């Protein structure tokens, strides 16, 4: 609220929240946010009317409104504002998909069906998920995604940089039968998405959080990758690049294993560094633990990509499903290593 | 009628086996076992069936119209199978043993748990009193061993102690005073609690890694490294074949059913890992 | 906010009057609109005497009573006899809430002694004798919500409901 | 089963890391950590144990240098070569030993404190040595891990 | 009275039409009902109770020719009941106790309603805690190549229970009691088998709520079909309704009759009952009359166990 | 014939006493055995109220009181509030039925009436908190049924089912 | 109150009066379980006196005196200065445990002063000579245990047992 306005107006509304502030009083702290707009008034020179009675009142009411039952009130503009956001947001996913070779089933603004080949299956989500916040590098068309917004020569249209998305990955052979495997895909962007829960925090404190992943399945191979670890996905500029920062290390750990730097017994080898490595309680154990690791495949000559130690404590939990997942963040990366190679 | 007759029996490893489910769990392990509802490494009634008849339609070519007819057919296949396999699930399996005690020596042991002997009792009772087949000792010693669920018992032995699969120290206690071998291999067996039992098992299993060399400058083709599982020689499974009555049933459970010892189950059999010893309970 | 009150609906004519309100709150219970009978409270797990009229409350969830929240105040008179409750009103179990309450309510609720005097067995009854179906509509529907014969010329919907959307679990002990 | 081992190895070690500086006797602990395992269950764990023993200082330097260790904080263990570097690993052992009820501290304690029961402390551990082995194998490759990866 | 059902293994209720290798570009695949159909049930009771010389036409004729009026299936654990439930799409194991609050609950107000039914479906629900789906994958294999044949891969949600899992019916005469009491018997898709253990009970029928569960799959008559579909509200507060099939008659090896109904686990206002009884020709309600000894129209209140027909 | 008695279980340990002597009676419906908490009742209709503790009713099958049927008369100094009624066993809804059914119940109920005062914010809440669950052992499971810790060495289960068997909507404020 | 009481085993027979609860009750901390006798807690850091046996307090760790356990207290014409003392029962070092005990101990050490007059010249001393045994199986088993000569006719277990252990260190002076 207090950075939805643009000016001096600010003030009024924030004091005006604090008036709200613990019950404070209505009826009496209507004077120290009224010397200002009675100040503003008498500021100008053809004022008519004031009944700053009934209108700080009313202004009062609006947010207290707001606050008691919990949501910000809907008017029609917010609706066509997130429908257009959604209708631009689909323009640009359906040149991500041309983009990566895929051919689209339905996407429709919020959701996508498409089909891609599986070596550009995790560029796209990457890309994706960064897109439907408005933050990419590329040109789609006569659209120019700029930081939360959409640049579209000259005309800034919003995006949805609040809003998660989940995403499904099915593996499937091209004789699998289309109903279990559209089902599949379905079941788990349904369940998985109401059912899991891994560690976020917001405000310094390590909560929960469920939405906002990807999963993926390889005939039997379930991995999860969480795709904000902040659960005000976005609330500066700067967060902007955060998402999807865990598919871009899985994709560069990819990059190393197919020119012949690591060894996939990567992929067979985390298990025994697990245990040692979830007990573990400092950072930079953890760090050279890791990196030790890896230096068992060895990733490198000196070497140089290590895991950006945002990664660990990260724990995946599920409400007691079929689905069976690692409870840490890079088993789940080396999963989704193992699913994404075992369909190619 | 309508499974009138039932023969349970012993599926022992003569090597290690491979009943593959292609990726079809969690672990580390990319060629897993087939996996019971508990984890615990089973043998589908499918595979088990599809390679006994197999095998049953090599080695007996002139009796291929009794198998047929006992195990299904391959075209005309609206003529129900008068013979059925249940799933084959893991009875006992071999581990290390680092005894501490009993002044007898043994460097492997038998291990369950009582989650196995919980199923197995489960195919044992809906057998016996139901069919006419008599074999009531076998789930006499299975109760009695069911008994004492919750602690780690040693059976026919002198333990009371020991280290299992290099990692594991347990402390054992004999049954009552003795009681007759379920196994006839002169080995003990320890049932173990279902926690610790379980440990001592997916620590009994084989899970090598494998590779395939690049044929000219003999080093490791890029990605040709993977991992399988294999259920270790000995290891011991539990099935039946329930029989429903008919005159070639007589056939199948008199000239074939009597001359089946070894056969091939699984995959890999190029690395050797299928052959297999079934023991009727009948003897 | 407003006090509303306890009444059950059988073939039994013997409650018209004691809720001494005839028009009572901006609010309204149960209003109609020339569909039926709508916004009935339906209570769980207390049978009825239906003769001599004290609902002895039993411990078996599947009997009910199918009441109305009764405008207005218990005639003040009585409630060293009933119970009564002030609920935070999202409790009460109403039937195709037409409208919207702003779950504030007090309710007083007759009562009866547990009657340890006989053993207890319950029966199921439904409205029968259409014409005692009117005349129920007469003694105690009409005074409390006159809106019917005000607005209402049709009576082939809003008497013939009541025909089976209330059934109860009666004593007879 | 073992699963706190590797929380028992924090509070345990407490230092053999920072503490153990000058990078001699501080880098030296991983041959501790490698070999002594290969050691440990090539040759047996009771001759590993004589081994470490015969390089402890055990007067009351090499007696009590440790058994702070069990109180207050972390033991800058400089002294001498590694014989304070050594008795930590001593300390270590029967740290595990003792926080796993193998064998108990009013023994322990009572055992390294009149040198007639020194001796049959390690008359004891020669019984225990198959189970203590077989237990301490994942607390030990745990600090064998930590060696390659931190020390 | 009561006869309880115990699978010695994963079982396969399969839920669709075909499951073999018709394509030849194409795997097949089959996913395992969670409970019975009562045609499954019935038809194994009537396998064991076979007569050579009766029938031959409308199955159920001969079927019912030998049955009692077959009361729906539920799961019991370890003497323990659990009792299905069913919304769009979803499907739930819960026990007695939960369905007390559910019809005030789905008249609870919009956000209190979705989330106490919400929690009724994902920590309430005991299914995957005692049932769950065990993948399956088979092949072919071509005797000359001792390779896979073409494509001939299929795969088969199993029924895998991690517990001890009985599945209940309770059924009225008693010389059929003790004429199959532990039969060994192939109850189920794809040969699986479970044993038959019969114990004689009692529980109460004449019951009528305002609400029922269905413990069985309601048949609709497809005469009263849009007088259904025009207004579902009237019958059903939550479940699903379905495209059904029969199932598979065995004696002449057809697919039985494709007919609408009401999936079990779905909760059917009484409304329902007369409606019913109040749509239907003598001649159908012959055929239903049977369709109903099978045990298809069978409610459980959420009260009590309350045992209930529809149309009896 | 006996006569039993549903005594709550809230948070509180308000459940040390509700009988004089140890057992008493002759028999017992409800049973401790190896496998479950065999025979509870859950009531319906009502709340708890963990300190001052007793019932506090608040109408609807959402509320619920979960309690056990014991043999014992209610401390001989009041039954003024406690319910005393008779029911013929089969409106006795038991959760996991296993024993014998009596036909002639007879129950005594710990209870204060409503009493009207404050908004019944009515919360449920779990049977947790291992520290405040364990020392309930031989005070709410031996102080009337001194059958367990007798031949079961099996109560780490039938307190599994402790974590979950008790439930209810308390009164808090 | 949980109470104990301490009574050394040296050759010397001098604890034959300070008995009061030979039995007295259904258990002791030491016994016999056909595999040793169990349980024997010492005390470390005390010498015995042959003249007026009883423990005296040194500061040497190891000058230690094994001592049997049982459920005693020594008839109350004693403890007026003995070592009258109550315990966690976990901080006790207690040789072959094999039952452990109830965190809290009214134990009693037959205490001497600490007598500056001489200094001490101690000598661990190990018992043999079965002349001096003998006495021993009436003269404190018979005394005290429930099970004596009940279970023991196969005497050799708490002979080399009692042999094997029970050391001491004494000021032999
Ligand atoms: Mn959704």
């Known amino acids: 609220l207090v950075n939805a306005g643009s000016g001096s107006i600010v003030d009024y509304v924030k004091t005006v929240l604090k008036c709200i502030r613990e019950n404070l009083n209505k009826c009496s702290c209507a004077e120290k946010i009224y010397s200002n707009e009675v100040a503003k008034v008498m500021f100008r020179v053809n004022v008519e009317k004031a009944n700053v009675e009934e209108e700080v009142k009313n202004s009062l009411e609006y947010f207290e409104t707001i606050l008691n039952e919990g949501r910000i009130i809907v008017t029609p503009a917010w609706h066509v504002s997130i429908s257009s956001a959604l209708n631009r947001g689909l323009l640009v996913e359906l040149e991500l998909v041309n983009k990566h070779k895929g051919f689209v089933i339905y996407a429709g603004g919020d959701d996508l069906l498409a089909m891609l080949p599986v070596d550009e299956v995790l560029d796209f989500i990457k890309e994706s998920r960064r897109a439907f916040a408005g933050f990419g590098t590329e040109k789609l068309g006569n659209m120019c995604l700029e930081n939360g917004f959409v640049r579209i020569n000259n005309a800034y249209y919003p995006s949805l940089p609040i809003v998660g998305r989940s995403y499904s990955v099915i593996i499937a052979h091209y004789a699998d039968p289309l109903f279990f495997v559209i089902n599949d895909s379905y079941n788990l962007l349904e369940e998985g998405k109401e059912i899991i829960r891994y560690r976020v925090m917001y405000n310094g404190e390590y909560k929960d959080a469920k939405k906002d992943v990807a999963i993926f399945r390889y005939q039997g191979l379930t991995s999860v990758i969480p795709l904000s670890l902040k659960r005000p996905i976005v609330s500066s500029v700067s967060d902007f690049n955060e998402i999807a920062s865990i598919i871009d290390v899985i994709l560069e750990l990819k990059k190393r294993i197919d020119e012949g730097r690591i060894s996939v017994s990567l992929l067979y080898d985390y298990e025994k560094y697990k245990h040692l490595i979830v007990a573990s309680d400092e950072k930079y154990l953890t760090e050279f633990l890791v990196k030790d690791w890896i230096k068992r495949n060895s990733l490198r000559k000196h070497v140089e990509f290590t895991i950006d130690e945002k990664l660990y404590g990260v724990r995946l939990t599920i409400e007691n499903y079929p689905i069976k997942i690692p409870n840490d963040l890079i088993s789940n990366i080396v999963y989704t290593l193992r699913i994404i190679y075992g369909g190619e | ?283 | 906010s407003t006090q509303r009150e306890y009444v059950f609906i059988p073939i039994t004519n013997s409650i018209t009057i004691d809720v001494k309100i005839t028009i009572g709150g901006s609010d309204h219970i149960t209003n109609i609109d020339e569909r039926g009978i709508h916004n009935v409270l339906v209570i769980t797990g207390y049978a009825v005497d239906e003769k001599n009229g004290r609902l002895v409350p039993t411990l078996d969830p599947c009997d009910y009573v199918k009441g109305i929240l009764v405008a207005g105040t218990p005639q003040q008179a009585q409630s060293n006899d009933f119970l009564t409750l002030k609920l935070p009103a999202n409790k009460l179990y109403l039937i195709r809430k037409k409208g919207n309450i702003s779950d504030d309510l007090k309710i007083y609720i007759p009562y009866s002694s547990p009657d340890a005097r006989n053993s207890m067995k319950t029966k199921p009854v439904s409205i029968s004798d259409d014409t005692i179906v009117n005349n129920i509509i007469k003694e105690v529907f009409d005074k409390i919500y006159n809106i019917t014969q005000k607005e209402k010329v049709k009576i082939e919907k809003v008497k013939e409901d009541i025909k089976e959307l209330f059934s109860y679990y009666a004593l007879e002990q | 089963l073992y699963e706190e081992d590797y929380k028992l190895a924090l509070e345990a070690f407490k230092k053999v890391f920072n503490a153990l500086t000058h990078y001699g006797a501080k880098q030296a602990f991983r041959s501790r950590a490698r070999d002594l395992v290969e050691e440990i269950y090539n040759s047996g764990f009771i001759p590993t144990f004589f081994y470490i023993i015969s390089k402890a200082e055990l007067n009351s330097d090499s007696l009590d240098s440790l058994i702070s260790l069990f109180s207050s904080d972390n033991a800058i263990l400089r002294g001498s070569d590694e014989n304070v570097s050594y008795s930590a690993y001593l300390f270590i052992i029967l740290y595990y030993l003792i926080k796993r009820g193998i064998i108990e501290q009013k023994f322990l304690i009572q055992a390294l404190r009149c040198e007639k029961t020194r001796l049959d402390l390690i008359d004891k551990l020669y019984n225990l040595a198959p189970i203590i082995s077989a237990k301490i194998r994942t607390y030990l490759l745990a600090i064998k891990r930590l060696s390659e990866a931190l020390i | 009275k009561r006869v309880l059902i115990k699978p010695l293994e994963p079982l396969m209720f399969r839920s669709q039409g075909e499951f073999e290798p018709l394509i030849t570009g194409s795997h097949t695949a089959a996913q395992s009902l969670i409970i019975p159909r009562p045609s499954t049930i019935a038809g194994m009771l009537g396998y064991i109770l076979f007569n050579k010389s009766s029938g031959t036409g409308d199955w159920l004729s001969d079927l019912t020719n030998l049955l009692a009026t077959i009361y729906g299936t539920f799961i019991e654990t370890n003497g323990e009941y659990l009792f299905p439930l069913r919304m769009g799409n979803h499907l739930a194991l819960v026990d007695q106790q939960h369905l007390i609050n559910l019809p005030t609950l789905l008249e609870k107000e919009y956000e209190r309603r979705e989330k106490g039914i919400y929690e009724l479906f994902y920590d309430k629900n005991k299914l995957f805690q005692i049932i769950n789906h065990q993948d399956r994958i088979g092949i072919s294999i071509d005797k000359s190549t001792r390779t896979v044949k073409e494509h001939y891969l299929y795969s088969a949600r199993y029924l895998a229970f991690k517990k001890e899992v009985n599945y209940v019916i309770f059924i009225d005469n008693d010389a059929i009691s003790d004429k199959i009491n532990g039969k060994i018997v192939n109850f189920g898709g794809e040969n699986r088998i479970a044993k038959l253990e019969v114990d004689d009970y009692k529980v109460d029928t004449s019951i009528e709520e305002e609400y029922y569960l269905a413990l069985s799959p309601i048949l609709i008559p497809d005469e009263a079909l849009d007088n259904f579909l025009d207004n579902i509200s009237d019958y059903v507060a939550m479940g699903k309704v379905d495209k059904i099939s029969l199932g598979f008659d065995i004696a002449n090896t057809k697919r039985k009759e494709m007919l609408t109904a009401i999936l079990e686990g779905s909760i059917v206002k009484r409304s329902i009952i007369d409606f019913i009884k109040n749509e239907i020709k003598n001649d159908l309600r012959y055929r239903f009359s049977k369709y109903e000894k099978i045990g298809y129209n069978t409610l459980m209140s959420l009260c009590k166990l309350a045992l209930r027909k529809i149309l009896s």
């Open chain 2, 1 to 283: 009628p309508y499974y009138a007759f039932a023969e349970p029996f012993f599926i022992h490893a003569i090597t290690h086996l491979h009943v593959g489910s292609g990726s079809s769990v969690e672990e580390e392990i990319a060629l897993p076992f087939q996996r019971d509802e508990l984890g615990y490494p089973t043998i589908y009634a499918s595979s088990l069936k599809g390679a006994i008849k197999s095998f049953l339609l090599k080695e007996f070519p002139d009796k291929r119209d009794v198998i047929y007819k006992v195990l299904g057919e391959d075209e005309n296949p609206e003529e129900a199978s008068l013979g059925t396999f249940l799933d084959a699930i893991l009875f006992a399996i071999p581990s290390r043993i680092i005894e501490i005690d009993s002044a007898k020596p043994y460097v492997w042991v038998y291990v369950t748990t009582y989650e196995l002997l919980k199923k197995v009792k489960l195919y044992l009772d809906s057998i016996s009193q139901l069919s006419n087949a008599s074999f009531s000792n076998l789930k006499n010693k299975i109760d009695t061993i069911l008994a004492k669920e919750g602690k780690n018992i040693t059976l026919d032995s002198d333990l009371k102690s020991a280290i299992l699969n290099e990692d594991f120290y347990v402390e054992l206690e004999a049954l009552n005073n003795k009681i007759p071998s379920i196994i006839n291999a002169g080995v003990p067996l320890l049932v173990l609690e279902d926690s610790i039992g379980r440990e001592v098992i997916n620590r009994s299993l084989i899970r090598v890694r494998r590779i395939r060399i690049d044929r000219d400058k003999k080093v490791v083709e890029t990605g040709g490294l993977w991992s399988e599982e294999y259920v270790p020689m000995k290891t011991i499974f539990f099935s039946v074949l329930l029989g429903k009555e008919s005159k070639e049933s007589a056939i199948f459970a008199s000239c074939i059913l009597r001359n089946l010892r070894y056969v091939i189950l699984g995959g890999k059999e190029t690395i050797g890992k299928g052959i297999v010893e079934l023991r009727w309970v009948k003897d």
